């Protein structure tokens, strides 16, 4: 499914990403909106083999099993495929936890580059929430 720029943010409120973690919900919508381009069945191939899943692009490497990311960590416990659904609550609830890392939001590389000290308000601008 690809979501609209307020309906996502309707979704991720529900779901209790506004200010998790003192993350407003603005920065969570930009970096879905650079990550995945709102689409919940996007997939990206990391070069150490590696795979990116879903509407936040999480990480094989570390986050969920693929089965076929040899040597990697499945610290969300659950198959990466459970994150490319049209229902959007495992990657949101794996979000949390990447979040709670100590890195922030710095885990997503588009985030840093695109989102990260921009008036990150515009991206819930006219959404009803
Ligand atoms: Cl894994």
């Given at each position: 499914?690809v ?30 909106k650079?990550?995945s381009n709102f689409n919940?069945?996007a ?87």
């Amino acid at each position: 499914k690809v979501f609209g720029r307020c309906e996502l943010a309707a979704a991720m409120k529900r779901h209790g990403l506004d200010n998790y973690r003192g993350y407003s919900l603005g920065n969570w919508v930009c970096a879905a909106k650079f990550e995945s381009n709102f689409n919940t069945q996007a997939t990206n191939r990391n070069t150490d083999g590696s795979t990116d899943y879903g509407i936040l692009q999480i990480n094989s490497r570390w986050w969920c099993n693929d089965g076929r990311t040899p040597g990697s960590r499945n610290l969300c416990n659950i198959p990466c495929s459970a994150l490319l659904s049209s229902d959007i609550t495992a990657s949101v609830n794996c979000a949390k936890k990447i979040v709670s890392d100590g890195n922030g939001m710095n885990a997503w590389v588009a985030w840093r580059n695109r989102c990260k000290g921009t008036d990150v308000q515009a991206w819930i601008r006219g959404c009803r929430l």
